[PDB]
Each structure stands twice: as C-alpha cells, then as structure tokens.
Design a protein around this ligand. Structure first.
Ligand code: A1IDM
Lengths: 367, 367
C-alpha cells in the first residue's frame, strides 16, 4: 500500500529577524538530511547559485563539498545568467560538476527555475528555496521534503529533462534532432497522482506528450474553486516587462476575478509591495481596491524578502512552486511545481498561510 | 456584377441641440423613404416601441399608420418588457400587428434588440435607432440604409427567426420541438460576404449551424488589429449587473488591452459617463487611466443620450450594432449587427468617428 501524502512534510526558511515560528522542518536541516543520507548522488537545480552569502549557506556548501570528496556524484544545474559566481563555486568544490543551462536559446527568454534537490532516488526537496545563502538563512522560503523513492524518482526525471540543455557542445539546447531524442517521461500527473501528490511542469515546449502544464493545472484549480482561494505569491500583476517591452498576460488574474465576482469565492491575496513609479502595479492595485470593497476579497502586502509561492484552494488543494503567477514565468520559464490534495498536508499549508496572513509583516492594503 | 458596399449608406440621428453636422441621411428621412417606397410589407424590430414621445417619431408613426391603412402588412416586434406602451400603440394603429417577443423564457434574461427595418425584400435599415421618438428626434443614433434586395432579404431572414418567439400560443418560445423546426437561415456571413457586407447575429443559442456569432467576429477583428481601434459605445466595463448580481465578462475588455499593450495599437474609446457610486465603473476608469499614460490609448466621455455602437478597425473594418460591448448583451440578448469592409463605407465611418471624437460633447477623461 502507498502512504497518505506520499511521506511529504512541509519545509520552510524563517529568519531570526522575522516573527515566523513553526514546528516544521527548516530548509537548513532539510539540506543537511539530504546530504547526510546521500549514498549515490545529489542533484540540485535552481536559477542562481551563491551559497556563501550567509553562514548556513556556507555550512551547507561545506557539507556538499565533503559529500563530493567522499565519492558522491554532485551535479548542480544553474541558468547561464547566474554564471557570475561560477568561478567562485568551482574554486571551492573542484569535485562538484556545475552545469550552465539555457532551456531557451531560440529567443533567450526561458530561465531555469528548478529549485529542487533529489538524492539516491529516495529523498527529495522541492520549493522556492534556491541553492543560495539567502534562501537558506535570511530569506523566508517554503517547500516540501519527502523520503518517498517513487516521488524522488519522478523528480529526478525532471532533473534529467533539464540537464540536457547544457550550453557546451551539441545537446538539447543546440540541436533539434538531439532535443527530439529526449525521453521526457513522468510517472505521476493530475490524472494519476501518487498518495495525493503530483508534479506539474513548465514550459509548454518542454512537456512532451505526457507531462502536464502547470499553467493549465493552476487555471483549472482556480476556476473550479467553490469556497476559498488563498494565494501568497510575489505579485499578481497581469503585465510583466520582458527586456524593454511590456507583456500582457491576464489568465490567472482573470480566473481569480471570475472566482471572486461570479462565484463569490472568499479570496485572500498576500503579495509583495510594489513600486509607486510602476503604473501597471498601481493600476492593478487600484483595480483590486474597488473589488475588495464590493466582493469578499482581501489583500495584504509584505516588504520582506520572501520567495514563497503558495496556492490553497478550498482547503482541499495545495500548490507550491518556485515561479510567480505571471505571464513571463508560466509562458517561458522552466520549473517544476508540487501539487497535493492530502487533507493533512493541505491543512498544514492552510495553517502556514493563516500564520502569514495575520503576521506583523502583512500590513493591510492601502491606496 | 454586385455593387461595391452593397448600396449601403450611412444614416444617423443628430439632434438640433447638438453640434453634430453631416451630409449623410437622417433616420427620419430613412424611415420616410422606407415607408413611402413600401409595396408589400414593413417589418420593424426593436426593444421598446414608443414613437409618440417626440414630433418626428409621431410623424413616422402616422406615415406607418397610413401605410397599414392602404393594405401594407405591418408587423412590429418588441420585447415583452416594452409592453407598457402596447395598449397605447394598438389604440392608434388597429391595422398594425404588434407582437411581444421573449427570446429567452428559460431564464428570462435574453432581450430582443433587433433595431432594424426591412421592406419588400428590397429596402432595409439596421442600426441603433429603435422605433421610438427619441431615437428619431432627440437621441443621437447611427446605422446604415440599403436598397439592395439580397441584403434586405438576408435581414428579413433574421426578422423571421426573431418573430417565432411570440409569447401567445405554442411557438419557438414555448415548445422545444417547434423551436427546433425553425429554418434559421443566412445568405451571407464572414466567410461569404456580399459587396463587402455581412450580418452577424446574437445570441449563440439562436444561430443554428450557419449564422456567425457577433461575439466571435468582434473578438477576432479586435485581436487581428494592427494599426488602430476606434470604439464609440456606451461603456466597456467588463462587469454588468444582471438582476441583483454582478456578472464578470472581460472578453472584449481583455482583447482590447491585448491590442493596446502587446501590439501597441492606437486605441481611442469614446464612452458614456459613469456613476461615481458604481465601484466597477470607477475601477475600470482608474485601470484605463494608468494605461492611457503608458501606452498609446485615449479615452473621452460623453453625457448626451447617444445609442451609437460603432467599431472601426485599421480603417478597413467597420461594425455597427444596437447592443453594447459587455457581458449581458453578447451572452443573452438577441440582435443583428452590420459589418463591412468596403473602403469607402469604412472611410465615411472613420469620418463620423473623427467628428465625434473632437466634438464638444467629448470631454477628455479625468479622474
Ligand atoms: C493591464 C492591466 C489591466 C488591468 C485590468 O484588467 N483591470 N480591470 C479590473 O480590475 C476590473 C474592472 C471591472 N470589473 C472587473 C475587473 C489591471 C491592471 C493592469 Cl496593469
């Protein structure tokens, strides 16, 4: 028999200067446990790589260095735009294989936002705590850890898909025929979850035929809401800025508004503060300001460094990712997202969101 | 050979108290010409019917009374909600057959917004000038008249489709089998226009299999814009209020924003003023206010009674209707809409929109 929740437990980074308290696992302890119990390999994937920025990050980097010295195959995937600290990394860990990934060389827009660890096809972590010192010590982060071998292997498959886009030599990022020969596989999705847990993936041109797009899954879970929608992301402006041009993408925006006005769903949005000079952010703010007073909608803003990307639907579905709900991310960036329906795990996630909502760092929206 | 523009000419109602001037045909003269040249029948369809409110409307009603007395079959279709003045109408014209229409008895939401005349399968008018004294004398209106027999017959087919929904006795508004036996036909659509002119129809459950939905046509013409979008409607709030519940429908709203931000289309919106107590209208206003200053978008408001529903795309497509661009109308109401691509007719429509844009009644948007 399979376990309920797939042996998944919540992990988060709560700095000392912040009032966030919980009995759950910390990202520091999580990475320590992943490295200690490692016997075959440790695969890590994120955007940037700079663990030495804080103390705990340096400690994790030292433990990983010891693991690589003992014979463990360490492979670290980071986007080619986080290539600044690369010369700093290889100088400290010559046995760790660092690989620059460019998942989109057609237009140079897609970015690698894996932000997950997998070890021995037995242990795994997935969240918004990248392999940096801030995401481990000073930046509040959220994610999930599991010692369930099948889930860890299904995440290792995503790591395999992402590794093939290395820049050096012909690979899936250079040749079309070699990229077409990528066994893009998945063992569990929304049509066949394991222990009430599955992985969604992004972007669309990297799914193959089996994997499920995170965009469609999130939009469906938002359109199928009946009771409550609780979102803690950075910002939900329907317009991003790619290069020097504004890009309009209101899919999640309009789905949430459809939930709020037509279906009257109690929605609470905890987002990061915005620049007063950005007219798009101010337009979004004053648009939601007239909707909070008309329908059952609440909005709070935070100013702290928080990478948390949490979605909770009807106290029955939970969705934790490393990408933010916007156009650029769900249209070009490549990432993996944890989705669960286990009532216990969703209840713990609801507890975390309730703690964050009434936190002192969550001031009410004022315009 | 077929004529260019399908013998169509612009018709409009410009009151004396307003500064609108044009050499085009007036709605009063248009109805006079339709009634005078009538030899077989005169079919009229609108929402409400109250011509005696003004002088010119009473004159048109008297001419129609004379036509009915001479033996012309006069049938007037009005929605069952405009049934107040019914006893006033039949008392003055006993020979005119007035019919109450309820196109939606399932939920009692759909309303008859035909707003067109057809005579002898030879002459026809279609616009936003209903069969009322205001739409002929005191309310600025817009529409098109044509003495082209095929176009008039294709509009008479729409009149036939709408007539079958009479309330008294079993008909297309009472029985399902009798409604299924409605020869819902059309001779021209966007895939086979005549002289660069075609009719779009609404709602979706009244199209059959041949007619084209006005919603899809308008959304496609807005998404396929490259140069300019000029809209003169009442309001473009993505939220209406049906009964005592708000209904969110941002399809046209989001298509226009997609045209403005992503494609940078120069868009000028001439809409009617809104209530300061309506939070949805204020939200829409302050949303567009931050977009006019960022992209090439301009907004002006008018306070006069104007039923004009004009859309102009790239100085190549023109769309004149009686319904307003919103959710309730294009989701439940039943109407017919004129669409043309003839460069001469679209140029005249652009002239009319330019005259209205710089008019004194068009004050710049201020918040
Ligand atoms: C491009 C953009 C578009 C919007 C937008 O679409 N605002 N519109 C409403 O918020 C609304 C108004 C009335 N009814 C329902 C919703 C907001 C911000 C931004 Cl940057």
């Amino acid at each position: 028999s399979v376990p309920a929740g797939a042996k998944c437990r919540l992990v988060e980074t709560l700095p000392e200067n912040m009032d966030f308290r919980s009995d759950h696992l910390t990202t520091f302890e999580c990475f320590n446990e992943i490295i200690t119990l490692a016997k075959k390999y440790i695969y890590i994937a994120s955007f940037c790589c700079n663990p030495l920025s804080t103390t705990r990050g340096a400690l994790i980097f030292d433990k990983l260095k010891e693991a690589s010295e003992k014979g463990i195959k360490i492979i670290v995937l980071l986007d080619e735009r986080g290539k600044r600290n690369l010369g700093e990394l290889q100088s400290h860990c010559p046995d760790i294989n660092f690989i620059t990934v460019n998942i989109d060389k057609k237009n140079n827009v897609g970015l690698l936002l894996g932000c997950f660890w997998v070890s021995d096809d037995e242990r795994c972590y997935v969240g918004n705590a990248s392999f940096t010192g801030g995401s481990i010590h000073t930046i509040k982060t959220l994610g999930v850890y599991s010692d369930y071998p099948p889930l860890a292997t299904d995440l290792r498959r995503r790591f395999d898909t992402f590794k093939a886009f290395n820049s050096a030599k012909n690979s899936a990022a250079n040749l079309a025929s070699a990229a077409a020969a990528l066994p893009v596989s998945t063992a569990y999705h929304i049509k066949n979850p394991i222990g009430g847990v599955f992985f969604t993936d992004s972007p669309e041109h990297l799914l193959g035929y089996s994997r499920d797009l995170d965009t469609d899954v999130v939009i469906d879970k938002l359109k199928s809401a009946k009771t409550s929608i609780d979102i803690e992301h950075l910002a939900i402006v329907p317009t991003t800025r790619v290069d020097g041009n504004s890009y309009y993408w209101p899919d999640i925006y309009n789905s949430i508004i459809e939930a709020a006005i037509n279906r009257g769903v109690k929605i609470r949005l905890l987002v990061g503060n915005w620049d007063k000079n950005d007219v798009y952010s101010m337009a979004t703010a004053r648009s939601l300001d007239a909707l909070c007073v008309q329908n059952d909608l609440s909005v709070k803003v935070f100013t702290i460094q928080n990478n948390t990307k949490l979605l909770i639907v009807d106290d029955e579905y939970v969705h934790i990712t490393s990408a933010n709900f916007d156009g650029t991310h769900y249209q070009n960036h490549g990432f993996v997202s944890f989705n669960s329906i286990d009532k216990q795990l969703v209840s713990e996630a609801k507890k975390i969101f309730e703690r964050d909502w009434v936190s002192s760092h969550s001031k009410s929206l004022k315009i």
